[PDB]
Amino acid sequence: GMDVEIVEELSKMLAGRKAVTEEEIRRKAIRCALKIMGARLVGIDAELIEDVTCSLIDLHFSEKVKIGDVLFYHPHVIKPEKEDFEQAYFEYKQSKKFLDAFDIMREVTDRFFEGYEAEGRYMRKYTKDGRNYYAFFSTIDDTFEDVDIHLRMVDEVDGDYVVIVPTENELNPFLKFFKQYSEDAKRAGLKIWVVNPDEKTIDPFIGYPKDFRLLKGFKN
Q1: Would you say 192 and 147 are in contact if contact means Cβ atoms under 8 Å apart?
Q2: Which InterPro entries does the UniProt entry name for this protein?
Q3: Both 149 and 210 in a single domain?
Q4: How many domains does the chain have?
Q5: With CB atoms 3.0 to 4.6 Å apart as the test, which of 7, 76, 82, 89 could cross-link to 55 if both were Cys?
Q6: Residues 144 and 162 in one domain
């Protein structure tokens, strides 16, 4: 905990912003919850994230402006200009992509880990014969930014820690991570696996399980 401390971390990330979306707040709330709780995130329910997001929308983005099918939120007499909507929109796309992929990722990862027993939503813990895997669901751009969190996470769990991210359309997201952090990831033993939400497949980007019986579950 606490819910208050997560709401304080979220309010640091959004300082100076004139517009946000609920899906952006929701995504960054899961990432702040991780930063503050680490492994204890396996015990967190969706209701913590509901309460955190409603901190910020219902620093305080109280006032609604609808642009097409997207609901933006802004402060009281702070007026969002084009540039603020454009950034809020870039963040909405990023966040919606993760959020749309989220449940398919947990389906594909469960299927990879059968029949390990499974618990958790935002971090998911898989256990079979006293052997544990810990899966955090994110995106590669987030993982890039949150890399210090993930590097420390590998030593904090009794088992293997894996970040599960979706496929991207461009090369740069995965390519810039490789250039900047692949060696740090290897040295720390951080695993990152890639889910195709369309094809319902999973593939390693960085790192492998330590059981040949799981290697069956990868696409290529």
Answers
A1: no
A2: AF2093-like (IPR049429), AF2093-like_C_sf (IPR049266), Af2093-N (IPR023291), DUF6834 (IPR049265), DUF6846 (IPR049264)
A3: yes
A4: 2
A5: 7
A6: yes
For the chain, the residues before each gap (C–N > 2.5 Å) are 58
Of the residues 124, 154, 177, the one at which a domain ends: 124
Cα 175 to its chain centre, rounded Å, is 18
HEC sequence for the chain: CCHHHHHHHHHHHCCCCCCEEHHHHHHHHHHHHHHHHHHHHHHCCHHHHHHHHCCCCCCCCCEEEEECCEEEEECCCCCCCHHHHHHHHHHHHHHHHHHHHHHHHHHHHHHHCCCCEEECCCEEEEECCCCEEEEEECCHHHHHHCHHHHHHHCCCCCCEEEEEEECCCCCHHHHHHHHHHHHHHHHHCCEEEEEECCCCEEEEEECCCCCHHHHHHCCC
Determine whether 133 is exposed, middle or buried from the number of CB atoms within 10 Å of its CB (0-12, 13-18, 19+).
buried
| Method of determination used here | X-ray
Report the CATH number that the domain containing residue 173 is assigned in CATH: 3.40.50.10670
